[PDB]
Structure 1
Amino acid sequence: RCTHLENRDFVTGTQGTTRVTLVLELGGCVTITAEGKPSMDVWLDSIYQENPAKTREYCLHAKLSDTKVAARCPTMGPATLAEEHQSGTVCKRDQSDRGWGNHCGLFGKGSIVTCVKASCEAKKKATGHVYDANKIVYTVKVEPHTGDYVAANETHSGRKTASFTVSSERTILTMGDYGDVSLLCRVASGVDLAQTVILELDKTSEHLPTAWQVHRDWFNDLALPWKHEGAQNWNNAERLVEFGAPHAVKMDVYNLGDQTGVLLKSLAGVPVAHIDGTKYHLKSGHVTCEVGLEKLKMKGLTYTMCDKTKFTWKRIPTDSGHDTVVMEVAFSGTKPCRIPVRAVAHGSPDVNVAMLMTPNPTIENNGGGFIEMQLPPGDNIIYVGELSHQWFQK
């Protein structure tokens, strides 16, 4: 959740910097590191609104019923059945080729209308929701970068959270023993959340997708029948119906079937949005923080060095990703000790080249001893006391 996340920046300062101003986008993480304070990771974990507002619904499959055909003789009048008074029904008026051998009198064209009742099928609804900047929640998380951490989904009593609305952006956070990071987070959505919609389908028992963040323009002009929250019936039922020509005095009525394919066509390469029932997640957004570290303290520098021998390599210094070396160690002897780390560049043994992200590495009780250092390029030798390993830097 930070050595992991490919989207990792650092931020470093003069000791007499004490504000930092970042942007955090989603599921990027930043490691802030600063002279004589402990490196923190800050990151933006979640944007969402709970019970967002429902928008129009869309029919993806029509239920057609009661084909109604009424037709008049070519002088007589024009025809009507009065179900074109009603809604959630689809009606075409044609003229039918009418003679004698079709119960008429004059040879001519003999006005005809057929209507049909259009309802939507059991669970083939598609449902918008809209966001309100005033109701949305931005979640930043701080966690010290000491790596007395766990593996990628197990919390931690240092590792704290701050939740910002638009309307409240000024939390202070207690980092186990290290003191207080302050946060100030000017919220910034992305689009007009009156121009942006979470679109949902019904979970139709497959490996098929449920949900998409999508512009409110595109949604609103979709090719489908629609209503607002549980309404009478459907406007634009005719989007899903089509009529035959008239033979005689009958006129065929068709269901252009199931738009599910058609919609997921539309949505090709739109990536799916996320949802925890209540909580609707934005996929897009960022937030911009003033991270106030005038008030962190070091991991207890109050401790005596680990006996320089009793270390063994939990993890071989391995390439990190983000342009650092990281290593775990086990040190069997005494308990809470400050660790002796150092590394040096062939040529020059009397000068330490280790630039630590892991400033005052300790081995604690439960455990500890992850080290992240950045090293000059070339053949170096890394030392945790006497324990050593090679390193080449590219």
Structure 2
Amino acid sequence: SRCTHLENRDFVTGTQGTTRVTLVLELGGCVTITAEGKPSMDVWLDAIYQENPAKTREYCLHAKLSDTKVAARCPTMGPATLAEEHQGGTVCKRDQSDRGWGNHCGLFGKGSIVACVKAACEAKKKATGHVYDANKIVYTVKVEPHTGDYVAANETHSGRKTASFTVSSEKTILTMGEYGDVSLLCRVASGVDLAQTVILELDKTVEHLPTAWQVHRDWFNDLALPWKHEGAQNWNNAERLVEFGAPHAVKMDVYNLGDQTGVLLKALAGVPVAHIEGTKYHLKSGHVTCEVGLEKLKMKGLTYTMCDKTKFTWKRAPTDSGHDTVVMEVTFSGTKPCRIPVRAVAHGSPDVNVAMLITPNPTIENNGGGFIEMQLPPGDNIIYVGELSHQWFQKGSSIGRVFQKTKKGIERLTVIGEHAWDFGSAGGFLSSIGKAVHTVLGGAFNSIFGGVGFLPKLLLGVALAWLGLNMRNPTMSMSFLLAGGLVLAMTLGVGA
């Protein structure tokens, strides 16, 4: 049960009639899944990485000058030239010179002087930029079977399984050890504005300093420095790192503007530090939606003798979880595999089993334990494990349970995004909207009930539909709409 200690967990109870269910995975969240007669599961979204990102621009810095040449001619000799005004990877300037009688020239006018320099960047000083590719991102999803013999802490778990999803990927299946198979027909979407961001990397190869940043494409494309495409050898616009001095008679020094790494880092101060591992480049925003097939999966520990030895002690006390659930740690002393007889009671009544149960059929074997989880109804309640009994009180209201479940259903439907509507066929449009709405209403369809069984609910839906057709005042006509909604939901039957 790894997700018991995150700050953003949510539940989905699926449906009794059919095992198929849908989920939304957001970075840092978790979606525990439950079934009427199948053991529970869990899901993750830990990393959104890309391997070998493509390269766009490669800015240089600390340009290295070499083999500078300057030449000039007297007035009326025609402008001078050097062979380097047309070679690849060079920078040149033209200006007049104040030649006179002291110089070898025969007149007293202004001549011409030209200078040229080759400009190749030093190695290990280039700031390369990379761009993601939505059609190649890799999404990571993890699932943890509810063995429950774990303290529920921060350390890793044994028996966990994983899978990877990419836009091209469509089908996948996992084994979950002896538990059984579960399928993930999934769909994925990129985080917002991929094209707006480019990753800048210095390649400095240093251990005690940051070696990557993430910034907007617009500012990056506008930086005033030398740049190149990959595979080229001549640097474009090198004239930004070279400043030429005033023109003397026959000399014009070409000053190197020096390294600028410090200025780039100061301007890049406060930008989020990028995350890089091996050839993987990570991201920190995303949406994944999958359909979980729970058809082939089966439960464990139903063939055990179910000992009534009644020898148990509490490893920990009932502590209120951070998300409307009860955590309980128990240790046995029977020295044998066995089911844990558990009873929930309210109002001190002889009647039992008045609480919903996760970690279905908690048991013991030659080794392991129990991290049994309980979801008691609000108020005074009694937890029984074997011969031991403890008193615990749960805050909140049943109305609150329905309100929060509907609010999270609407919030999840909001998060599914623009993928929740298909206009190809009218039947598909209606079926998709109707299923999404029934996913939203699932929590409210099983709020408070008691009586004969499941079948009478359909009859009550028909009675509600007939009552809406009593030909009464319009202000109380909502019963017809409610009856129709309940009648479609009867095909699922999630409340009795």
TM-score class, shorter = 0.7 to 0.9
Q: CA deviation at 1:243?
A: 3.0
Q: CA deviation at 1:350?
A: 4.4
Cα distance 1:294–1:238, how it changes in 2: closer, same or farther (>3 A)? same
Q: CA deviation at 1:31?
A: 1.3
Partner-residue secondary structure (3-state), 2:350: strand
Aligned residue for 2:488? none
Q: CA deviation at 1:231?
A: 3.2
Alpha-carbon distance in 1 for matches of 2:230, 2:157: 43
Alpha-carbon distance in 2 for matches of 1:115, 1:355: 83
Partner-residue secondary structure (3-state), 1:2: helix
Q: CA deviation at 1:152?
A: 7.0
Note if contact 1:39-1:146 (Cα within 8 Å) is conserved in structure 2. Answer: no
Aligned residue for 2:184? 183
Q: CA deviation at 1:390?
A: 5.2
Query: Number of residue pairs matched?
Result: 391
Question: Scaled by the length of structure 2, what TM-score is found?
Answer: 0.67
Alpha-carbon distance in 2 for matches of 1:366, 1:389: 25
Q: CA deviation at 1:293?
A: 1.6
Alpha-carbon distance in 2 for matches of 1:360, 1:43: 24
Compare 148-157 and 361-370 and name the one that shifted more: 148-157
Cα distance 1:269–1:186, how it changes in 2: closer, same or farther (>3 A)? farther
| Cα deviation digits, residues 344-383 of structure 1 (max 9, x gap) | 5566674555433322222233313112333444565544
Superposed CA RMSD in Å reads 3.4
Q: Which is helix-richer, 1 or 2?
A: 2
Cα distance 1:99–1:275, how it changes in 2: closer, same or farther (>3 A)? same
| Cα deviation digits, residues 299-348 of structure 1 (max 9, x gap) | 32333446575333333333433332323222122332222344555666
Alpha-carbon distance in 2 for matches of 1:354, 1:52: 51
Alpha-carbon distance in 2 for matches of 1:152, 1:99: 87
Cα distance 1:159–1:111, how it changes in 2: closer, same or farther (>3 A)? same
Compare 260-269 and 4-13 and name the one that shifted more: 260-269
Note if contact 2:141-2:164 (Cα within 8 Å) is conserved in structure 1. Answer: yes
Note if contact 2:187-2:289 (Cα within 8 Å) is conserved in structure 1. Answer: yes
Q: CA deviation at 1:92?
A: 2.9
Alpha-carbon distance in 1 for matches of 2:332, 2:154: 26
Q: Which runs of 5+ in 2 are unaligned?
A: 393-496
Q: CA deviation at 1:208?
A: 1.8
Q: CA deviation at 1:142?
A: 1.7
Q: CA deviation at 1:290?
A: 0.8
Partner-residue secondary structure (3-state), 1:114: strand
Compare 101-110 and 183-192 and name the one that shifted more: 101-110
Cα distance 1:338–1:85, how it changes in 2: closer, same or farther (>3 A)? same
Question: Scaled by the length of structure 1, what TM-score is found?
Answer: 0.82
Compare 248-257 and 63-72 and name the one that shifted more: 248-257
Q: CA deviation at 1:122?
A: 2.9
Compare 345-354 and 25-34 and name the one that shifted more: 345-354
Q: CA deviation at 1:184?
A: 1.0
| Cα deviation digits, residues 204-239 of structure 1 (max 9, x gap) | 424222234555554444333223335323222223
Alpha-carbon distance in 2 for matches of 1:172, 1:249: 78
Q: Which runs of 5+ in 1 are unaligned?
A: none
Q: CA deviation at 1:183?
A: 0.6
Cα distance 1:248–1:198, how it changes in 2: closer, same or farther (>3 A)? same
Note if contact 1:73-1:104 (Cα within 8 Å) is conserved in structure 2. Answer: yes
Aligned residue for 1:331? 332
Compare 20-29 and 344-353 and name the one that shifted more: 344-353
Alpha-carbon distance in 1 for matches of 2:264, 2:70: 32
Alpha-carbon distance in 1 for matches of 2:103, 2:10: 81
Partner-residue secondary structure (3-state), 1:230: coil
Cα distance 1:119–1:346, how it changes in 2: closer, same or farther (>3 A)? farther
Alpha-carbon distance in 1 for matches of 2:342, 2:264: 58
Cα distance 1:202–1:38, how it changes in 2: closer, same or farther (>3 A)? same
Partner-residue secondary structure (3-state), 1:57: strand
Alpha-carbon distance in 2 for matches of 1:190, 1:296: 32
Partner-residue secondary structure (3-state), 1:261: helix
Note if contact 1:129-1:198 (Cα within 8 Å) is conserved in structure 2. Answer: yes
Cα distance 1:217–1:350, how it changes in 2: closer, same or farther (>3 A)? same
Note if contact 1:308-1:384 (Cα within 8 Å) is conserved in structure 2. Answer: no
Q: CA deviation at 1:260?
A: 3.3
Cα distance 1:106–1:390, how it changes in 2: closer, same or farther (>3 A)? farther
Greater relative contact order structure (CA < 8 Å, 6+ sep): 1
% identical equivalent positions: 97
Cα distance 1:390–1:232, how it changes in 2: closer, same or farther (>3 A)? same
Alpha-carbon distance in 2 for matches of 1:157, 1:380: 34
Compare 277-286 and 361-370 and name the one that shifted more: 277-286
| Cα deviation digits, residues 254-306 of structure 1 (max 9, x gap) | 44444434444554444344334333333333221111123332232333446
Partner-residue secondary structure (3-state), 2:93: strand
Cα distance 1:204–1:384, how it changes in 2: closer, same or farther (>3 A)? same
Note if contact 1:308-1:387 (Cα within 8 Å) is conserved in structure 2. Answer: no
| Cα deviation digits, residues 133-175 of structure 1 (max 9, x gap) | 4443323222213333587787767422222332231112222
Note if contact 1:343-1:380 (Cα within 8 Å) is conserved in structure 2. Answer: yes
Cα distance 1:237–1:168, how it changes in 2: closer, same or farther (>3 A)? same
Q: Which is strand-richer, 1 or 2?
A: 1
Q: CA deviation at 1:197?
A: 4.1
Alpha-carbon distance in 2 for matches of 1:349, 1:261: 76
Partner-residue secondary structure (3-state), 1:153: coil
Q: CA deviation at 1:186?
A: 1.3
Larger radius of gyration: 2
Partner-residue secondary structure (3-state), 2:246: strand
Note if contact 2:150-2:371 (Cα within 8 Å) is conserved in structure 1. Answer: no
Partner-residue secondary structure (3-state), 1:390: strand
